[PDB]
Subunit: 287 residues, 4 copies
């Protein structure tokens, strides 16, 4: 009967940007996929078609490239400039969400302006501004890792639908997807990302696993303990199954050597590892 | 300081199920992509690696196939059965999230047991249980639509970054991605899905659009006004830009006929249309 | 010692074109993904960097839109016009390959200028010109089909590595990818495409299958037998495995009802069905 | 006219294999995506549904895992064993096509049994046996490269549809996809792959490009000149357009710094660089 406009946001999504730094003969590359969305009073825009407040998505796009011209130290700095620009520049704009993916490049044999793409991981950054407060969630994804041993899984409940055999030696493979919320913008974003990444890899590799849930916890723990600027870290880890193939039918044995890597289904272990006391329901996770 | 385990869930994702109903010569096909994750007391599993509370992801998988044997009338019904089984079947399991995608099939010339997949859209359903609380969200996705005319965009702000030219005749294309929350479990899930689908399509086509935002408001308004069982509908619509090519350099005009369909970037207009007085932020939207 | 430039071709790939026909209120849509590549004398371009013979890929792109202004009856007519233009327009250009994917759209409730995308199949066309001769291969792909019964596979040899069990009732699912070469350009492209599509569906559905190889064969024979303008048809059909799940461990039987749809690996059955006495090594299949 | 069965092949595609070598504490990882198809007399299987000659695809799959148990020095060596097995093992099987994608892994901090995926490239191998002949084509793909300068494109023809402007400084970006055919199986497969790779990257980075065509020619020539065992190298290089954004409308210049990385369309420059007098139509290039 009575309809009302609820939460809403709009902008330009996936603006691919490449910024070359060449004031010297030693060129640098910054490759981003930027998304800009504004929040505020767009009541008339939706219910009436009154675009008076609608800052064109096309215009948000231009702004991205226009700002890019000036250069940026980090992806987070670039995003902070955009968010500040749209919120302060417009009355009806009370905040928004600004995200970006960062793609890495490696010099080809230390060449000054020749590079090859490093596709082993993708860095993420998300800025959400709400009136007077703002927040930044950095992250990493697409980083596949695997232990060929040093992992077991047993002691789990056995109901009438349970057929999984316990084991003390299996492969543990997953795709590292983690995002951590900063409790301050005053952060050396590049140094932290590098450190967090190292901590994640280290924890995953050195922890004798009794379960993916356990490994993820240790991973989240190493980060929280190391960076005070980080309140919480959320991770989503798929248990990419590697089934030890049965070779007895062929007169052979399989001493944990030959595996079949199945695509689907896969186990999905997810959890938030937070700092005691820190918030437990930040609006930035609402997306 | 002190590290703590916050929110967390685990289970089996993307279990591909195909249920054939063949008690009669007229076979029926049900195609699903099912994901099952449990919520509860998994503290020890994460902190100490004690899996006494860890119902194997493999077991959740086996349960889906086992329960499929008995058949099911609707996707939502199927998910409801799994949710209650796990929550009730284990005391440390206080809830969870069970979602699925439903893929459609059409008979090959009305053949009794020969079909071809209809890929024009994908139906979704998500069930979330929190103690005694049960919430279901159904939706549609991958349904691309386009208006060759009956769409305009003008009256928007113009700053030093605005280049977009006002227009009273342009193409409006998008991928319909919608999800609505049911306020009751007693719903004719299939009838309502078809209805809502028709309402979204009808509103998209018939509304003389003055902005994607307006078309979306009308699409949702139609849904709420028609279905008492729905408290809100969320839509994420990309403005898939079709650029009218400039052929004047070659001496030809382009009477809104020849277009270049860009991939990225694209505008992304999102909004929530709800029944007045309905809950503002149900937890199911957090996932 | 002596390095040589062999086969080569270049151009613009994936030019997304949308042509709206609106001489009346009843609008029509033509959606294409065009790829144009030229062949001829480009020796100097590769060996010396002399671009005098290089009709820019950008130019080929502009040419697609420019020609699009005049409209076209079919996708094949459009490709024929392009190839002709590039081969006759440039002395050193002696040939090329012009391909296109055609995307289908359906009217939203018979609306005059609002449509929804039909993603159940994709039509393709390829034109190859070599000197004074030209050949056209049309096709369909992405059309997924499945028989819930009417399929068996037994009588295969057995060796020490064989474990597959015989069957007289299984699911037979595949993705229809078919490409047929015309032996003349004087063809009703649209009607033949609709016909072939129909013949492939009917043969797949009605043939009681003793193997995917046998089914694919009947599908090809029907095409060759029905259309004189077709010298040969090639098909690539994956055997999309649907494993009848073993429910015995859970105290249940599975009367051919519950299946697991595995992604990989999959059987891949391919063959060429030709008219007796027709070329078997046509260049168009090489590229 | 009468219908006939032309060229044909069948087998199991994309069998995902992971071979862990753990005779010592220093584990090794081989990760492949294998496809095996057979060629020979399968007339009866297609025309009659007589499967006596049909070595089950499931069986081909089993053989892959069984052979993997014995380990293999290289991907090529692995395909050769499979190929000889099926051709020599069955009188009616006269040949076939075996292919594989090899995925790379790097140790985590030189850890003995923990690794992370190097997704920056994918190695490929294809074996085709025709009687006693064994043809091997090795290749690389997914290797994205870019030059921020040292690339120009001018001197091209300006026909009635040419608007592209001449330039002496632009970004040159592509996805290195290359495949080279060995004239002998007596090859240190791993060493040549590393060399070839090095050669392709070097020629790309170090050549002052006057056109993608020129760059590609030098890449291929360096390979043909360096390795006597390679008869030819084919390359398919997309010109991934990075458009220098026009910021003048915003009162700023853009000294080759701010770019827009467009997805489609894109230039596609392909060519074959061979040893003078070598075969130019090897069957292996048709699949
Ligand atoms: O690490 C694991 N966690 C789980 O929850 C699980 N279920 N099956 N195997 C498993 N492995
Ligand atoms: O419908 C539209 N809404 C927007 O917000 C927008 N921005 N540019 N074009 C647009 N079109
Ligand atoms: O390197 C290039 N080769 C081409 O053929 C071309 N066409 N446009 N730009 C181009 N760049
Ligand atoms: O139809 C089939 N064809 C084959 O070649 C095969 N191999 N295993 N199962 C099979 N089924």
């Amino acid at each position: 009967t009575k309809v009302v406009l609820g939460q809403n946001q709009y902008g330009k999504a996936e603006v691919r940007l490449v910024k070359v730094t060449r004031n010297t003969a030693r060129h640098e590359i910054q490759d981003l996929n930027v998304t800009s969305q504004l929040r505020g009073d767009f009541e008339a825009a939706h219910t009436a078609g009154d675009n008076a407040h609608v800052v064109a998505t096309d215009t948000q796009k231009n702004t991205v490239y226009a700002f890019a011209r000036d250069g940026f130290a980090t992806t987070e700095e670039f995003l902070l400039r955009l968010g500040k620009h749209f919120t302060e520049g417009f009355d009806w704009v009370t905040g928004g969400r600004w995200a970006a993916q960062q793609f890495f490049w490696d010099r080809i044999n230390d060449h000054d302006h020749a590079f090859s793409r490093n596709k082993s991981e993708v860095r993420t950054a998300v800025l959400e501004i709400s009136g007077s407060e703002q927040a930044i969630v950095a992250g990493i994804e697409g980083l596949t890792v695997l232990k060929s041993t040093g992992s077991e899984f047993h002691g789990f409940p056995r109901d009438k639908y349970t057929t999984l055999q316990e084991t003390t030696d299996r492969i543990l493979a997953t795709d590292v997807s983690a995002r951590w919320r900063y409790n301050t913008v005053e952060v050396d974003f590049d140094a932290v990302y590098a450190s967090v990444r190292g901590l994640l890899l280290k924890a995953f590799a050195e922890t004798h696993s009794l379960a993916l849930q356990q490994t993820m916890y240790e991973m989240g723990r190493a980060v929280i303990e190391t960076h005070p600027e980080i309140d919480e870290i959320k991770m989503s880890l798929p248990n990419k199954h590697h089934f030890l193939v049965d070779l007895q039918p062929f007169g052979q044995d399989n001493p944990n050597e030959v595996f079949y890597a199945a695509d689907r289904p896969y186990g999905l272990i997810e959890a938030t590892i937070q700092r005691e006391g820190s918030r437990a329901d930040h609006p930035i996770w609402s997306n």
